[PDB]
Design a protein around this ligand. Structure first.
Ligand SMILES: CN1CCN(C(=O)C(C)(C)c2ccc(C(=O)Nc3cn4cc(-c5ccncc5)ccc4n3)cc2)CC1
Length: 350
């Protein structure tokens, strides 16, 4: 009495049971991996649980086993749960679907943005969110770990309740989240220093130049992702709205300046260059799109004030082409931008 999609997915409806324990009461989301559903845990007193239900397919089962492993390791090294990673409470195999139970949190920061008409988070929210991202990922980075798949969808508000405001300048309503506490989620791609590193990681929009150019990667990959995320929080649109490598590299140059020549000498992806310059068709669709839409980083600042100038300096440093010269999260946490945190934000007491 258990059935699947043509692809992996478990067919299930509201009211279904799993492990004589988890009652499904809602659908929360869908990913490439499978499905996430709200459940009530009838062993811990009807307590709410986000239940990630993985496709009955080898690739994905493998990834989920790897995720369980990483969450196990994080839990060993952060028993106090001070480093803001989503809390795994249980895992199991249910008819070939790996299932992982997590603490129920609110909406992810992509969905909040979307439900807010892609109107950006205000700077104080961007700062607090950036701080927590830096804090959480420094911890994984010092424990020989790289997330690799950092993006707004994988950052979740603990509670996404909002208050509705009216913007005078913009003549419209704006949702402003009441508590900016977040957690980091989805460790299905996370990789230890000693494990094999695939040539290509991260979803395209959050992918660093060392990956595209196949120079190898490690923790600096996450730092680049974080810089794209911060930008996306602050403007509400994606920094590199791209779908192929050459375009992406052109956008990196239009936005950040020339790719350093040492990376160009090192890469085996010489088809992207000629005499040390990027080569590309300015008359194609991608060409015209990039020319119309991608401008230098600083031109996207919304205010002139110090806190804004500092955000952009930090971002600029997170988006350094050379992963060896890119700012580390330990250093990021000391950037003067975080001066503006409230003491409560700095100590993680909301
Ligand atoms: C559909 N309805 C939409 C309307 N609702 C809501 O506006 C509330 C505020 C009640 C709500 C919204 C979203 C969540 C949620 O989506 N929460 C979650 C996902 N989620 C996903 C991982 C996760 C992922 C991927 N890999 C690992 C873990 C972990 C925790 C986690 N919490 C909850 C409440 C009710 C729901």
């Amino acid at each position: 009495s258990v059935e699947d999609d043509k692809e992996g997915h478990l067919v299930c409806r509201i009211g279904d049971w799993l492990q004589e324990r988890y009652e499904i009461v809602g659908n929360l989301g869908e990913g490439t991996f499978g499905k996430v559903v709200e459940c009530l845990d009838h062993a811990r007193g009807k307590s709410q649980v986000a239940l990630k239900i993985i496709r009955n397919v080898g690739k994905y089962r493998e990834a989920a086993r790897l995720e369980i492993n990483v969450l196990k390791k994080i839990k060993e090294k952060d028993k106090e749960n001070k480093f803001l990673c989503v809390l795994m409470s249980d895992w199991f195999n249910f008819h070939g679907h790996m299932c992982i139970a997590f603490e129920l949190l609110g909406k992810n920061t992509f969905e909040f943005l979307k439900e807010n008409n892609f109107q950006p988070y205000p700077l104080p929210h961007v700062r607090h969110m950036a701080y927590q991202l830096c804090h959480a990922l420094r911890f994984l980075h010092e424990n020989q770990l790289t997330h690799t798949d950092l993006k707004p969808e994988n950052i979740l508000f603990v509670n996404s309740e909002f208050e509705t405001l009216y913007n005078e300048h913009k003549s419209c309503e704006e949702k402003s989240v009441k508590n900016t506490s977040i957690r980091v989620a989805d460790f299905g791609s996370a990789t230890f220093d000693h494990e094999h590193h695939t040539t290509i990681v991260a979803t395209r929009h959050y992918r660093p130049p060392e990956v595209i150019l196949e120079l190898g990667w490690a923790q600096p990959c996450d730092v680049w992702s974080i810089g794209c995320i911060l930008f996306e929080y602050y403007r509400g649109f994606t920094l590199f709205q791209t779908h192929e490598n050459r375009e992406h590299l052109v956008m990196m140059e239009k936005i950040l300046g020339p790719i350093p020549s040492h990376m160009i000498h090192r890469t085996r992806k010489q088809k992207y260059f000629y005499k040390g310059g990027l080569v590309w068709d300015e008359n194609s669709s991608d060409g015209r799109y990039v020319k119309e839409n991608c401008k230098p980083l600083k031109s996207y600042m919304l205010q002139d004030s110090l806190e804004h100038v500092q955000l952009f300096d930090l971002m600029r440093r997170m988006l350094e082409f050379d992963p060896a010269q890119r700012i580390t999260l330990a250093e990021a946490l000391l950037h003067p931008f975080f001066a503006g945190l409230t003491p409560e934000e700095r100590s993680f007491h909301t």
